[PDB]
């Protein structure tokens, strides 16, 4: 039968132009008063999935 997408993965990764995946940074959900403005600022933009984790992400998202 058709492979089933890991739905939670589809809610956290989007495929980019050259086949990589973008994701939102962790650590910007809650307790934030104690975190420096610089640290939170650098967590705001999306980042690319690293080479080690690309295999896991690709396995989870066959239909990306």
């Amino acid at each position: 039968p058709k492979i089933k997408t890991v739905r939670g993965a589809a809610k956290r990764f989007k495929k980019t132009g050259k086949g990589g995946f973008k994701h939102k940074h962790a650590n910007l959900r809650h307790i934030l008063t104690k975190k420096a403005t610089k640290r939170k600022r650098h967590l705001r933009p999306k980042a690319m999935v690293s080479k080690g984790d690309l295999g896991l992400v690709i396995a989870c998202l066959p239909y990306a």
């Binding site: 939670g8 956290r12 939102k24 959900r29 896991l56 989870c60």
Partner: protein
Amino acid sequence: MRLNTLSPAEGSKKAGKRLGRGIGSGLGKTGGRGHKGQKSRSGGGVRRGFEGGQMPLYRRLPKFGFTSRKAAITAEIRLSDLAKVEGGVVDLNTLKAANIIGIQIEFAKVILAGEVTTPVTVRGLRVTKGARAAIEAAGGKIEE
């Protein structure tokens, strides 16, 4: 040429692996599975994304975004598709008739992709700056 003189192209018919048929094959006695453990077992192996129990990548990262329903009914049209509309005028219905956009598309945008060589009238579509310049250089017209 006969039914007994026809051969496949070289390199097109690689033989399949056959595990467990003796020492000489290179795949005897463990079938390439190595020694024991979960992965050596029939049916063995862990699910996709599993990392051994550590909070896996697809869960330690946050969800983001929402899905636009409008995006699903919006298409893009290349300049190379302008000629393929038979009738000289490019609009939603003529684009659909030529199989350029989907039947349920309601909004469409012409972009600078490919090249246009004929005077065409674009009607009811959005057009990017570059695509508009290209169409108008080709003698075309853009009507809203």
